[PDB]
Every structure is written in structure tokens, then in C-alpha cells.
Design a protein around this nucleic acid. Structure first.
Ligand SMILES: [Cl-]
Ligand SMILES: [Cl-]
Ligand SMILES: [Cl-]
Ligand SMILES: [Mn+2]
Length: 196
DNA sequence: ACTTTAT
DNA sequence: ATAAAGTATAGTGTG
């Protein structure tokens, strides 16, 4: 089984949908693969207030801590949302407790390397095809918000090697992705079209 | 390395 | 006029 770890940049205009979907606020889902009978099985790993939006939480955190007087730019990357997962076979092997420990462990990796107070949310979904986590990492450091500074080319190449290794050291049997892999990312909807 | 942003 | 942070990046799977 491969360790699946990948980030998507979230601007203020993305976080509204990310909040509503991650929290499962609508009863109907366009995703035919969400099982609403299973949604009460999901859980959140941070101690965040569920009544507070991601955009509000993150903006408040950055404004209250940033060293500059200048406003957060309208196009700022407020957080990097990491999907943490593996394949179906990997999770088939694990009980509820081990599965939670798996996501808590991925989360510790990012807390330890990028700052505990930067893990804005850690939403574990068990109501879709495969257990996975949406974890929002605020790229905030030395009083500055900059995804550019935190997750550059060398950093993403480091995580692909070091994250699977850290999971392995903590008891999880999965390997890193292919080094220099030539895969092109497809969206969930695109990937589904690919399969049949 | 080239633009966009908010001073 | 300036400079920080915007643009991708690295990885696999039905997020
Ligand atoms: Cl909160
Ligand atoms: Cl200032
Ligand atoms: Cl999609
Ligand atoms: Mn999900």
C-alpha cells in the first residue's frame, strides 16, 4: 500500500465549500459515494469550535499573530489542505482504534514539523469509499503567512520521502510513492470518469 | 523568474 | 517604488 499525501491550496473563496462539505452540513450529497447513514462515524481531531467557519478561524489566527501591518492579500493561501489516506487494502487491516491512531499520527507529523497551532482542522471521513483525512495546515511562520515559503518544491519532495517513513516508524505498513513519479493529479470527479 | 498585491 | 507572496511543486486514488 502507498501512503497518499497531497495538498491543495485554499483561498478564502474555497474555504466556505470546504467547511460545509467537511462538516457534512447538507443532507443531500451530489457525491453518490457519500453514505449519509455513515456520516455520524466521521470525527474531527483538532479541538476546534465546530460552529466557527474555517475562513473565520484562520483569518482570526493570522491577523492576531502576524508581524506586518499590511492586510492579508485577497488572494492569500489561507491554508494548505492535505488529503491523508492510502488504499482500501491498507485500512481493511485496521480496527477503529488503529485507524484513528493512523490519522492522529499523520497529524502529529505536521504539528511537529510545521507548528501545532497551524493545524486548523483535521476532519476524518469514514462515510466515503476509503478512510481519509482532510487536514488544513496554515502556512504561518516567523509571523508571516506564506504557502510559498512553507511548501516549496524541495519541501514537497521531502514530505514524500519523510512522511511515509515516519508512519512506518510508528507501526504503519505502507511505502512512499514512486520517486520522481510522472503521474498527473486528477480531480475526484475526473478519476471516477477514468474508472469503470 | 514573472506578476499581483497592499501599502 | 518596494517587497512579500501570488503562480507550481510531489505523491496516489473513487479525497
Ligand atoms: Cl475554533
Ligand atoms: Cl507594517
Ligand atoms: Cl471533483
Ligand atoms: Mn472526504
Amino acid at each position: 500500500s502507498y501512503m497518499v499525501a497531497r495538498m491543495q491550496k485554499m483561498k478564502a473563496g474555497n474555504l466556505g465549500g470546504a467547511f460545509k462539505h467537511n462538516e457534512r452540513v447538507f443532507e443531500t450529497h451530489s457525491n453518490k459515494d457519500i453514505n449519509p447513514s455513515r456520516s455520524h462515524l466521521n470525527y474531527e481531531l483538532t479541538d476546534r469550535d465546530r460552529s466557527v467557519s474555517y475562513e473565520k478561524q484562520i483569518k482570526d489566527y493570522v491577523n492576531e499573530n502576524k508581524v506586518s501591518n499590511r492586510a492579508i492579500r485577497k488572494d492569500a493561501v489561507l491554508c494548505d489542505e492535505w488529503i491523508i489516506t492510502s488504499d482500501k487494502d491498507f485500512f481493511e487491516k485496521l480496527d477503529e482504534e488503529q485507524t484513528r491512531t493512523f490519522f492522529e499520527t499523520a497529524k502529529n507529523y505536521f504539528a511537529e514539523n510545521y507548528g501545532e497551532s497551524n493545524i486548523a482542522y483535521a476532519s476524518v471521513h469514514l462515510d466515503e469509499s476509503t478512510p481519509h483525512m482532510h487536514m488544513g495546515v496554515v502556512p504561518f511562520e516567523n509571523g508571516k503567512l506564506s504557502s510559498k515559503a512553507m511548501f516549496d518544491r524541495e519541501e514537497l519532495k521531502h514530505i514524500q520521502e519523510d512522511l511515509p517513513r515516519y508512519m512506518s516508524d510508528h507501526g504503519f505498513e505502507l511505502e512512499r510513492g514512486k520517486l520522481n513519479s510522472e503521474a498527473k493529479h486528477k480531480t475526484v470527479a475526473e478519476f471516477k470518469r477514468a474508472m469503470a
